[PDB]
Amino acid sequence: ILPGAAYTEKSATYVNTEGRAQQTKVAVTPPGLAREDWKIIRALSEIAGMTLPYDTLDQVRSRLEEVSPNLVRYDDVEGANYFQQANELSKLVNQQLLADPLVPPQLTIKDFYMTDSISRASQTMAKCVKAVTEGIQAVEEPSIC
Amino acid sequence: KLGLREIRIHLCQRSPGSQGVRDFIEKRYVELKKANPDLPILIRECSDVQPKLWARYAFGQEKNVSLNNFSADQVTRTLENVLSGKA
Amino acid sequence: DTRPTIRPRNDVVHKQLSAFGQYVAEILPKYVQQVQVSCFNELEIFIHPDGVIPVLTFLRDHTNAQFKSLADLTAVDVPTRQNRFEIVYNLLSLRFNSQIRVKTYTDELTPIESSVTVYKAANWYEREIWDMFGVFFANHPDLRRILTGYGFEGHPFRKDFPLSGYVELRYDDEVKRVVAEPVELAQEFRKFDLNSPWEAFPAYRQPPE
Amino acid sequence: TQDTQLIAVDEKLDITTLTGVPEEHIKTRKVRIFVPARNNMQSGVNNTKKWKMEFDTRERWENPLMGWSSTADPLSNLVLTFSTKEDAVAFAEKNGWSFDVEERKVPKPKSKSYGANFSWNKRTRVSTK
Amino acid sequence: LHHALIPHGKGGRSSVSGIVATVFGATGFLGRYVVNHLGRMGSQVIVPYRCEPYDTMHLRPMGDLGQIIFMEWNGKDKDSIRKVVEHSNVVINLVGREWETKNFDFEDVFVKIPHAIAQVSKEAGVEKLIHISHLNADIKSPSRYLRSKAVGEKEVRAAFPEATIIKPSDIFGREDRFLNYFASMRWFGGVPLISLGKETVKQPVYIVDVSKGIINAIKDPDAKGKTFAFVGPNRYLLFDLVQYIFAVAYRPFLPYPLPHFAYRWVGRLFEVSPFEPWTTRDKVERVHMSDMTLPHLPGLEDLGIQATPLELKAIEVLRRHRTYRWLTSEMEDVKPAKTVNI
Amino acid sequence: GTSVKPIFSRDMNEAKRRVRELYRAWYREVPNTVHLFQLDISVKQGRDKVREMFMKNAHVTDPRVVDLLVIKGKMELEETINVWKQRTHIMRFFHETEAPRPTDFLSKFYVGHDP
Amino acid sequence: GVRTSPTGEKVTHTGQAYDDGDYRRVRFSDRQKEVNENFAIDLIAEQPVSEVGSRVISCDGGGGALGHPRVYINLDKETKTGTCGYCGLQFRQPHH
Ligand SMILES: NC(=O)C1=CN([C@@H]2O[C@H](COP(=O)(O)OP(=O)(O)OC[C@H]3O[C@@H](n4cnc5c(N)ncnc54)[C@H](OP(=O)(O)O)[C@@H]3O)[C@@H](O)[C@H]2O)C=CC1
Ligand SMILES: [Zn+2]
């Protein structure tokens, strides 16, 4: 088991569904002995022998820029195009569509809460899940105090 | 093995310095992928980038080749020489 | 009266100080940049640095000015402005009892000429600025560090300097002496987020752009 | 007009060694400038009208005594204000801190009319006040 | 590791290193120094004591508030040991005297006390134990000091299989009773070396070196079970060593030839004082006993520390004994003694 | 903009001159401050510390900055010469109680979260 | 109420109790873990439920100016007892 850092402890980057690459800054240090997720990989590589060239955050961002130049440009949608050639590119297999009705995995507010590891770890998520499941009179928390 | 594992293309959005490659993938890409369906021709298009080409072969080695103002036939050749060298 | 809480307004002193401000502006147009008198009857003169010696001398010597007392000398670091540091000279008159203030600007490196001769009280005050803001003073008789500890670094009143400093000192038996160590607080300074997001004084609103 | 033996000095200021900041604090530390977003719990606006710079957060461990929040980096609760981002970035480079830039996000002005609360055919008609 | 034991900080006073020491008998010489390295890095030491806490106030500065908790302990009490080591991860044994107390015999402070320490420690569940014992310890050495230390080592190792036994050679450093010993030997007339002391080689170590080695052995993962030997970089024959320290102190040197039995008589005479005898018979049977070489014992540099030569750091220790005629003199005036190397 | 006011030195050559006799004074000082302050420092390992501190600010190229370092070293020289400084402050340059700090990335990862 | 830990320590009103290993218990050997017996959790529960007969009830906490700021609690909900947030006395309608 290699403990890692959560999304509020690292200083890494994520991408929205529209392609814009945003950055998450470090809020609180990772608990215990867990380090960041790229630092541990690089240290693992250095110990194993096949050392990676990058050593701090700016170098790994530069390397990721080398891999993809859109993933460093922050908070601006990198204009995506070339759809028609992609359409003409697949258009070969048939893979006849099954008659199974389309049902998203989330169908009611009860399953909107319990999706990821963070949600499962949470207790308030379970409290609201059980609020939704049975009925109204299950989760009354005194608000005056 | 040493045969190339993925080929990455970084072309600018509108700037004329990357115009030629934009025409290349415009017409000379679909059959190129049909020729090597297994091969990941990645096109990580972006803005204000000089038209550049990465080539990752095996073991984590990568090859750098610029395509600054490269014509469509010229970029076709600079892809063909790399693809032919399946090693 | 109708305004028992609001402070009294003394417009006579205001007009008279404004007249003297026009006076001093006309007398030395070479170094003076902008003179204005505050609402509470306190006049300030914004001069170019090269006028540190001349203007002060004119304020120290002139018969109709007659200011010989250096109340205090201070710098006010503000990182925003191009020349971050601004130096304030506070003068008090005896024959014409009143308080005048002259203000100059300098960055970290551009030296500002040392008064000392105009006001021999400035000397120690002068040293403080150099030892507290980094503003070196040209041909100051002895610009050695004055306040901070021996072998210190930086200039603490700079707004970038942290509140807790950089290095503490404590006994070490391994070397049998007081030693300097990098900062490691036992409890970190909690920085409260005051200054409510609602506008306080409409009069002093910054113009838009 | 201001003769003081002036000299062209092209390279930017390097007051770093003058500031006395230790080597790892001037090198490792990364500072970002930004306009602080208003607290959504409030509708007040005059807190996103300045350019503040702040530094990357560091280790925050709990002391054995009461579980306090002892830390090691002195430049943690240090935030500097600036009128325009140009002054802030100039300060950052001349001091020597690796800086990050975020553009001043401002609210887009939306067309608002009370006559939209009611309508003859538009969906925007409200159902309660 | 326990949730209150994860290392935290940056090695300062308030850094939580993750060490809970015990430093038994830390109220003296190296006990003062090791706590320093334990206090400076940040670790809740549980330093026990038998004397008056006055002779322990000098441990208060060398630690942030909430550290170096003091607990009363008695030698002939297993319960006191249990109380001191109930909540610890490392137990450090430094309890050892040099003169035979009329109440505490030599062996108890060197086998019975260490044996009880090891037994109660192992019962408690402490991870690592570091017992200290003279390098020259031999079962049949003429001095009962080394003999008792050898039986104590074997007893502790039997009781605590993974104890990290440390065998330091003669140690110097401020209050040393070795450098200051020969330095004050002028007080008792001319220096009475046994047979003028041309036949005794010594391998001294700087106290900071041994203390740092103890700290690394705490941090070292493989230190369990092993037995380290602490030796200096260079080794001096006794006569030139005394020459060097006297020259550093600039006090005139008057070597005095002496038979072994005559020095035994003098040691018996000195053993009758009622407080801290300047020398003992056992001390005489120690000084002429040269320190052997134990290459098969893992040394000091393998731990990570670098041995500091005696010439560099003799100034501070011998500085006080210098009179004002040469109290202003530096190191370089004294040329390093003719070390007899390998 | 580019034009600026000097402190003393006009060009890199004259500031280069000022640091020269600053090092002169430090050289002639080190032995008798070792003697006077009863330093545990040795003469050679006194001089090399001066050399390493002078080499520490090797990157500086702006003149005014060089005048600033030279005048600050001048203040340091006065503080040392007439015994206003104290032995502890002199030792402050030598980092004794400060534990060695690792440099490689692997040790940094082992110790804790820090770049 | 104050209860003993499995180790033997007296738990606090907040629920603090050092665990089995919990090396930070040497602080209490040769000393004591100072805990207050007058638990505020239960010293307010046994107080009688006031039966004042009005819709909305004022509460200053007793002592007038010496009490807490005057709050108007609502004795409306039939299924529970209204209580002042500051002090904690439970107010209820006299069974309507
Ligand atoms: N050059 C050297 O000094 C060398 C020393 N050693 C070993 O190092 C150990 C410690 O040496 P050092 O620190 O110089 O010795 P000191 O006598 O200077 O200090 C002994 C320490 O243990 C305590 N102590 C000693 N005897 C007793 C006792 N009978 N009962 C309770 N506590 C006791 C002392 O406290 P208190 O004063 O209250 O008794 C003090 O904390 C000994 O085992 C010694 O043989 C090994 C090689 C070389
Ligand atoms: Zn109440």
TrEMBL record, chain A:
Source species, domain of life: Eukaryota
UniProt-annotated location(s): Mitochondrion inner membrane
Record family assignment: Belongs to the complex I 75 kDa subunit family.
Function: Core subunit of the mitochondrial membrane respiratory chain NADH dehydrogenase (Complex I) which catalyzes electron transfer from NADH through the respiratory chain, using ubiquinone as an electron acceptor. Essential for catalysing the entry and efficient transfer of electrons within complex I. Plays a key role in the assembly and stability of complex I and participates in the association of complex I with ubiquinol-cytochrome reductase complex (Complex III) to form supercomplexes.
Protein name: NADH-ubiquinone oxidoreductase 75 kDa subunit, mitochondrial
Organism the protein comes from: Sus scrofa (Pig)
UniProtKB/TrEMBL annotation, chain B:
Coarse class of the protein's main subcellular location: mitochondrion
Disulfide bridge positions per record: C12-C46, C12-C46
Membrane-topology annotation of the record: Peripheral membrane protein
Occurrences of domain Ribosomal protein/NADH dehydrogenase (ranges): 13-86
Compartments it resides in: Mitochondrion inner membrane
Keywords: Acetylation, Disulfide bond, Electron transport, Membrane, Mitochondrion, Mitochondrion inner membrane, Respiratory chain, Transport
Assigned protein family: Belongs to the complex I NDUFA2 subunit family.
Described purpose of this protein according to its UniProt entry: Accessory subunit of the mitochondrial membrane respiratory chain NADH dehydrogenase (Complex I), that is believed not to be involved in catalysis. Complex I functions in the transfer of electrons from NADH to the respiratory chain. The immediate electron acceptor for the enzyme is believed to be ubiquinone.
Protein name: NADH dehydrogenase [ubiquinone] 1 alpha subcomplex subunit 2
Record gene name: NDUFA2
TrEMBL record, chain C:
Keywords, alphabetical: NAD, Translocase, Transport, Ubiquinone
Span of domain NADH:ubiquinone oxidoreductase 30kDa subunit: 47-166
One BP term from GO: mitochondrial electron transport, NADH to ubiquinone
Compartments, record wording: Mitochondrion
An MF annotation (GO) of this entry: NADH dehydrogenase (ubiquinone) activity
Chemical reaction(s) catalysed: a ubiquinone + NADH + 5 H(+)(in) = a ubiquinol + NAD(+) + 4 H(+)(out)
Keyword check for Transmembrane: no
Main location: mitochondrion
Domain of life, source organism: Eukaryota
Record's GO cellular component terms: mitochondrial inner membrane; nuclear body; respiratory chain complex I
Assembly with partners or alone: Core subunit of respiratory chain NADH dehydrogenase (Complex I) which is composed of 45 different subunits. Interacts with NDUFAF3. Interacts with RAB5IF. Found in subcomplexes containing subunits NDUFS2, MT-ND1 and NDUFA13.
Role played: Core subunit of the mitochondrial membrane respiratory chain NADH dehydrogenase (Complex I) which catalyzes electron transfer from NADH through the respiratory chain, using ubiquinone as an electron acceptor. Essential for the catalytic activity and assembly of complex I.
Family membership: Belongs to the complex I 30 kDa subunit family.
Name listed for the protein in its UniProt record: NADH dehydrogenase [ubiquinone] iron-sulfur protein 3, mitochondrial
Organism: Sus scrofa (Pig)
Residues of the whole record sequence present: 42 to 250 of 264
From TrEMBL, chain E:
Binding site residues for NADPH 1: G25, T27, F29, L30, G31, R50, C51, L94, V95, G96, R97, Y145, R177
All residue ranges annotated as the NAD-dependent epimerase/dehydratase domain in the record: 22-225
Residue numbers binding NADPH 5: T27, F29, L30, R50, R97, Y145, D176, R177
Organism domain of life: Eukaryota
Compartment(s): Mitochondrion matrix
Chain positions recorded as NADPH 3 binding sites: G25, T27, F29, L30, R50, V95, G96, R97, Y145, K149, I171, R177
InterPro entries for this protein: ComplexI_NDUFA9_subunit (IPR051207), Epimerase_deHydtase (IPR001509), NAD(P)-bd_dom_sf (IPR036291)
Pfam families, per database record: Epimerase (PF01370)
Cellular component annotations (GO), alphabetically ordered: mitochondrial matrix
The protein's required cofactors: FAD
The protein's assembly and partners: Complex I is composed of 45 different subunits. This a component of the hydrophobic protein fraction. Interacts with BLOC1S1. Interacts with SLC2A4. Interacts with CLOCK. Interacts with RAB5IF.
Assigned protein family: Belongs to the complex I NDUFA9 subunit family.
Name under which the protein is recorded: NADH dehydrogenase [ubiquinone] 1 alpha subcomplex subunit 9, mitochondrial
